[PDB]
């Protein structure tokens, strides 16, 4: 429904789904096809 971008969906599963799926019965490794959100500080060398 157009509300969540791709970056958004990735954060949602990383933050709310992955950890429990990864403790679920018989689950070995779990690979996220995406990345969890971090606080992103994008620097500007000119303003610095």
What residue ranges bind its own copies (CB under 8 A)?
Answer: 19-20, 22-23, 27-30
Q: How far is the CB of 47 from its own copies (least distance, A)?
A: 20
Cβ atoms of 16 and 37 within 8 Å: the answer is no
Nearer to its own copies by Cβ, of 29 and 45: the residue is: 29
Report in angstroms how near the CB of residue 25 gets to its own copies at its nearest. 8
- Residue 34 burial (C-beta neighbours within 10 Å; 0-12, 13-18, 19+): middle
Choice between 7 and 30, CB closer to its own copies? 30
């Amino acid at each position: 429904d157009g509300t969540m971008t791709q970056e958004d969906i990735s954060d949602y599963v990383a933050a709310n789904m992955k950890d429990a799926i990864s403790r679920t019965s018989g689950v070995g490794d779990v690979q996220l096809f995406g990345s969890q959100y971090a606080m992103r500080i994008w620097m500007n060398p000119n303003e610095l």
